[PDB]
Amino acid sequence: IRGNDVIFVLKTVEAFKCDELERYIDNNPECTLFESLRDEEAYSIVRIFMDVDLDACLDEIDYLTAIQDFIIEVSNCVARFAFTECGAIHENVIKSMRSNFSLTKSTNRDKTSFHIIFLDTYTTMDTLIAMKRTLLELSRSSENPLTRSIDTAVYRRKTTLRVVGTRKNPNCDTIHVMQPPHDNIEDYLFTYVDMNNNSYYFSLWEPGFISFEDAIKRVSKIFINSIINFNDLDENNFTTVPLVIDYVTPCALCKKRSHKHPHQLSLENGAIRIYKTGNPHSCKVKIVPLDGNKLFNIAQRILDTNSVLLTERGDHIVWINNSWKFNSEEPLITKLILSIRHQLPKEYSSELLCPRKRKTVEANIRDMLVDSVETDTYPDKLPFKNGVLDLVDGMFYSGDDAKKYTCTVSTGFKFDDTKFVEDSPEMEELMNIINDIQPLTDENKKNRELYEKTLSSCLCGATKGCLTFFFGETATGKSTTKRLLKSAIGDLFVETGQTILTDVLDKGPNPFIANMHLKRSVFCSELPDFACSGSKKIRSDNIKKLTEPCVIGRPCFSNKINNRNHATIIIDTNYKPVFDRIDNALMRRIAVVRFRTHFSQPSGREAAENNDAYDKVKLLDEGLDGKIQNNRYRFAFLYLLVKWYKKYHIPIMKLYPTPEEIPDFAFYLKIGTLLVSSHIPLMTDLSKKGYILYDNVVTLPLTTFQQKISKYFNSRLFGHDIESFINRHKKFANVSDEYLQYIFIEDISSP
């Protein structure tokens, strides 16, 4: 659509532009033109507009407060309707609606009418048609005289709206005068679509009220004083007889001792309006409802601010003090009900001070929350205690903006821009520490890049399909890297023991199984070396099961077993891992990060001078570990992590395994590179080489195979591995021995 600059009008027809309409209006002040839609189907996208009419006069203060509350209520209700039905964003709609709006007026001083248009919000006419019932409920479920007077009509096909500055009728001289700051004729058109940057768009007496006597009693209680002309009002004289009151005490509505004329009660929109006659500003207007609870309307107003949603599992997440809290032990809805009373009208705030009413208006909220939402869906954002830091752009959001993202976890500490710097001595000290841990030589280049990549994945809410191994001799200070990462990433990071590396992953109630829920990094240290006999091999089942994007595990006294998996798993030790089970999936799901830095004191430095444990040796310092424990380089290291993530995270970043540094998998690699599955039309070459083919399957004797492979590989090194491989690929039968099928790649190449 890209907006429309043509305004179609009806004289009781034309298609004029902004300048054309302005010139025509200036030429003819008395012309009556109604702005409508030239074609309903073509340009159904229009602005959001409302028309309000209340036949009474109000002063400046009352009008100001009433219009403020009217904007608040209408914007919240429309944003809630957009969120539930049109799939929009609540915060965006609220911001667009409250940012800028055009408000007209009426030249008549005996009544208050206007047409209000929200400039930046645009939606299809079908959406405004569907909003009919919701807006009618809002109109009939409020106390504000402006909100109660909303005309739900004008939401029909091919509707028309009276243009500003033109008389509605030739006989009626009253016209609507524009108000600051718009002052332009294009700012009061409900079809003038002007989509731009700061904008948003979305799309898909009746007896039945109450007994008369109770209404009369309510009116009398409002008047406080007794009615002089009592026992005279009935069904017929409801809006005819004046209400004469004795001025025993000053009027509750006006606070004055007396007035020139009595009051009068009228019926409108299922409510009773009490107003004085003669001078209009002598007494205010009193509104009396005729249906609905008072505790249900409060629940609706608290609900349609989108602050008490429920999760996809069944937990009600509330928004208190700029953070999405939630607890399943002491539910927080009553805290929210108490703390939100300031954003509610005067009559709705005194109710939320009795604890027996903040349980009624809370049962209502729980009964109105049907269907769920999804939490922590955007993985490129880091939730801090006072907001959300964006990673792709680096901009920080605080306050209601962070509400847009259902961040159910947090790092635990606030975000400070002063410490968040680039050129600081702490940054240089951290860079020196990292260089000491990771020398930047060309030999280390690839390993250092893998280090930076696997260390920067901690700022990702997505799931990763690899498990990097920190392999390095002692005194390499991997604990320093662990401490720096913990200080940078807050309480999201978790350190776990080897309990998951040996036992069954799910099995029974495992605390680390549930703790992997939404934690962004899991670290294991000092692995139980399986080189010595007795220690269990690294459970291949657990490693395979930890890679999936889901976690299945239920702790003691619980039933939930589904957890979202975001943690990057890192294992650090000085011993090569040993896994009893081996398959191609394992060979494609293991990465190794090598450490070649020795941090040793001078006393043993000579002992480390010729040591083969590390490719370099340098003096250590006991005064650094405490510094890392004191969150010294926290924000500089966080900046480094952000830079690494930016330089590494392409539109799709993946953890690539490195199956070359693991000594155990080298045997399988050598076997595969020298022997694979056995090619029918190559019998002559096999016969020349000595091998024979029988029953369409080339075979050799088991003793012959052992003799052939004796020289190719060291039998004493991996005799158990060779026996296990033979058992796995065993075939048996045939001739007078077992059957072994393979191709000697080294012999296959040689003719």
Catalogue the active-site residues.
Answer: 151
Contact partner at residue 334 from Zn ion, a second copy, none, CB < 5 to 8 Å by partner kind? a second copy
3-state secondary structure of 607: helix
Q: How far is CA 264 from the centre of its chain?
A: 52
Q: Which is nearer to a second copy, 254 or 587 (CB)?
A: 587
Backbone angles phi, psi at 670, to 5 degrees: -65, -40
Identify residue 331 by its one-letter amino acid code.
P
Decide: is 343 part of the binding site for a second copy (CB under 8 A). no
User: What is the number of alpha carbons within 13 Å of residue 441 lying toward its C-beta?
Assistant: 10
Contact partner at residue 581 from Zn ion, a second copy, none, CB < 5 to 8 Å by partner kind? a second copy
Quick check: 29 and 170 in contact, CB under 8 A? no
Contact partner at residue 254 from Zn ion, a second copy, none, CB < 5 to 8 Å by partner kind? Zn ion
Q: Which is nearer to Zn ion, 251 or 333 (CB)?
A: 251
Instruction: Give the DSSP H or E segment for 451.
Output: helix 445-456
Residues 456-495 that bind a second copy (CB under 8 A): 473-475
Backbone angles phi, psi at 401, to 5 degrees: -60, -45
Q: Note the residue count of the chain.
A: 751
Task: Candidates 51-59, 253-261, 338-346, 395-403: pick the segment binding a second copy (CB under 8 A).
Answer: 338-346
Least separation in angstroms between CB 743 and a second copy: 7
Q: Which is nearer to a second copy, 172 or 717 (CB)?
A: 717
Quick check: 608 and 600 in contact, CB under 8 A? yes
Residues 191-220 that bind a second copy (CB under 8 A): 208
Distance CA 343, CA 708 (A): 86
3-state secondary structure of 86: helix
Decide: is 283 part of the binding site for Zn ion (CB under 5 A). yes
How far the first Cα of the chain sits from its last, in Å, is: 73
Residues 566-595 that bind a second copy (CB under 8 A): 574-575, 581, 583-585
Q: What is the DSSP string of 664-720?
A: HHHHHHHHHHHEE---TT-HHHHHHHT-EEETTEEEB-HHHHHHHHHHHS-TTTSHH
Least separation in angstroms between CB 81 and a second copy: 16
For a second copy, the binding residue among 174, 293, 343, 408 (CB under 8 A) is 293
Distance CA 654, CA 453 (A): 10
- Position with the least CB separation from Zn ion: 254
Least separation in angstroms between CB 629 and a second copy: 9
Least separation in angstroms between CB 296 and a second copy: 5
Cα-Cα-Cα-Cα torsion 132, 135, 136, 141, nearest 10 degrees, comes to 160
Least separation in angstroms between CB 476 and a second copy: 10
For a second copy, the binding residue among 3, 242, 355, 719 (CB under 8 A) is 355
For a second copy, the binding residue among 148, 176, 273, 358 (CB under 8 A) is 358
Q: Which is nearer to Zn ion, 282 or 424 (CB)?
A: 282
Q: How far is CA 673 from the centre of its chain?
A: 49
Contact partner at residue 292 from Zn ion, a second copy, none, CB < 5 to 8 Å by partner kind? a second copy
Contact partner at residue 57 from Zn ion, a second copy, none, CB < 5 to 8 Å by partner kind? none
Decide: is 10 part of the binding site for a second copy (CB under 8 A). no
Q: Which is nearer to Zn ion, 283 or 466 (CB)?
A: 283
Q: Which is nearer to Zn ion, 250 or 355 (CB)?
A: 250
Distance CA 637, CA 627 (A): 13
Distance CA 734, CA 738 (A): 6
Distance CA 214, CA 196 (A): 53
Least separation in angstroms between CB 348 and a second copy: 10
Q: What angle do CA 586, 590, 596 make, to 5 degrees?
A: 150
Q: What angle do CA 154, 165, 62 make, to 5 degrees?
A: 70
Task: Candidates 45-53, 169-177, 276-284, 288-296: pick the segment binding a second copy (CB under 8 A).
Answer: 288-296
Contact partner at residue 676 from Zn ion, a second copy, none, CB < 5 to 8 Å by partner kind? a second copy
Distance CA 99, CA 456 (A): 38
Structure tokens at 88: 């929009």
Distance CA 94, CA 121 (A): 9
Q: Per-residue string for binding with a second copy, 244-283, x by CB under 8 A?
A: ----------------------------------------
User: What is the number of alpha carbons within 13 Å of residue 344 lying toward its C-beta?
Assistant: 25
Task: Candidates 74-82, 173-181, 275-283, 724-732: pick the segment binding Zn ion (CB under 5 A).
Answer: 275-283
Decide: is 338 part of the binding site for a second copy (CB under 8 A). yes
Q: Which is nearer to a second copy, 231 or 610 (CB)?
A: 610
Least separation in angstroms between CB 239 and Zn ion: 19
Decide: is 219 part of the binding site for Zn ion (CB under 5 A). no
Q: What is the largest CA-CA distance in the chain?
A: 129
For a second copy, the binding residue among 179, 269, 334, 706 (CB under 8 A) is 334
Q: Annotate 413-437 with three-state secondary structure.
A: CCCCCCCCCCCCHHHHHHHHHHHHH
Quick check: 179 and 103 in contact, CB under 8 A? yes
Residues 226-255 that bind Zn ion (CB under 5 A): 251, 253-254
Quick check: 352 and 341 in contact, CB under 8 A? yes
Contact partner at residue 283 from Zn ion, a second copy, none, CB < 5 to 8 Å by partner kind? Zn ion
Q: Which is nearer to a second copy, 237 or 714 (CB)?
A: 714
Structure tokens at 24: 């025509």
Distance CA 539, CA 544 (A): 9
Q: Which is nearer to a second copy, 28 or 714 (CB)?
A: 714
Q: Which is nearer to a second copy, 105 or 545 (CB)?
A: 545
Beta strand pairing call for 697-699 and 692-694: antiparallel
Beta strand pairing call for 598-600 and 617-619: parallel
Contact partner at residue 293 from a second copy, Zn ion, none, CB < 5 to 8 Å by partner kind? a second copy
Residues in binding contact with a second copy, number by CB under 8 A: 73
Residues in binding contact with Zn ion, number by CB under 5 A: 4
Distance CA 171, CA 582 (A): 94
Distance CA 178, CA 163 (A): 11
Task: Candidates 71-79, 148-156, 607-615, 703-711: pick the segment binding a second copy (CB under 8 A).
Answer: 607-615
Q: Which is nearer to a second copy, 279 or 724 (CB)?
A: 724
Q: Is the peptide bond before 181 cis (omega within 30 degrees of 0)?
A: yes
Residues 619-678 that bind a second copy (CB under 8 A): 626, 652, 672, 676-678
Contact partner at residue 314 from Zn ion, a second copy, none, CB < 5 to 8 Å by partner kind? a second copy
For a second copy, the binding residue among 20, 173, 347, 746 (CB under 8 A) is 347
For a second copy, the binding residue among 371, 374, 393, 423 (CB under 8 A) is 371
- Judged by the rule CB under 5 A, the positions of this chain that interact with Zn ion are 251, 253-254, 283
